[PDB]
């Protein structure tokens, strides 16, 4: 499957087995002037947010984790 992956945002073939695209956001030390960080990649299981303001969005179609 294909998902948008960071750092350089492009569609990439997921490592086989991984069929879930994800979007992960969190707050940096620069969040006041730049906003939330955002990570994009593949996964075999939708990640579980550690704690705090980490929110994770998952889907299961090609290139569904578009950049906000």
């Amino acid at each position, epitope marked *: 499957r294909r998902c948008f992956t960071t*750092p*350089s*945002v492009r569609s990439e073939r997921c490592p086989p087995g991984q069929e879930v695209c994800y979007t992960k*956001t969190w707050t940096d*030390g620069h969040g006041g002037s*730049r*906003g*939330k*960080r955002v990570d994009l990649g593949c996964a075999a299981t939708c990640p579980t947010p550690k704690k705090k303001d980490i929110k994770i969005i998952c889907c299961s179609t090609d290139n569904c984790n578009t950049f906000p």
Partner: antibody
Amino acid sequence: EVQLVESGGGFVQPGGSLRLSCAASGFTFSNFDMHWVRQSPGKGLEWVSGLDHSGGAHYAGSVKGRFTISREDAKNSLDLQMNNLRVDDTAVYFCVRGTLYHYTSGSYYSDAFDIWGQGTLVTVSS
Amino acid sequence: EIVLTQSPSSLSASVGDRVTITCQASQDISNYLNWYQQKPGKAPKLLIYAASSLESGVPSRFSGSGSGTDFTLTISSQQPEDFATYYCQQANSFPYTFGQGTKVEIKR
């Protein structure tokens, strides 16, 4: 996993030259700021030069005019042509990737140095 | 050229001790300061960027503080794999500059 590999180091006499190259695993140079950082017991870690994502080159003062950093687009080769070398240039040279962090406001480059090659040894001696 | 002054250049610590490393910049650099860890024979590893933000995979015992000129790296509980040399690095203006390093050694 993402890696950087250096090549072209060795032993050279004062006034000599050396062409270091860097090859990346898992990413493309033109999307990132790339840097060369050297390390020696005596001056520590020292940023030598950088070639940002848009194609502009930058150099440290002790090296400007003698070193040339360049990129072979789509060829996976970042080079540092070091000319008129000095004993003072003896160091381990690291190929270093400038970080690329994405925010809801866009992309930001070189907040830090996240990928470091294994290093190549350069020794200038008579 | 921004000068970074790391203190101490060396320090001894036991497992479980609280380690404190400081870094002082010769001028204001906001929070554009990073911390690296380096083992002998190896390349430095990025640990903290933006003074306080950890990289992925870095244990929670590492933490950073400061903005302006005075910065701190703290290891809440020294572990065996933490005996290394630690460098601060500013990303405020050209040229990028590093501190002289703090070598954490085994106390006995």
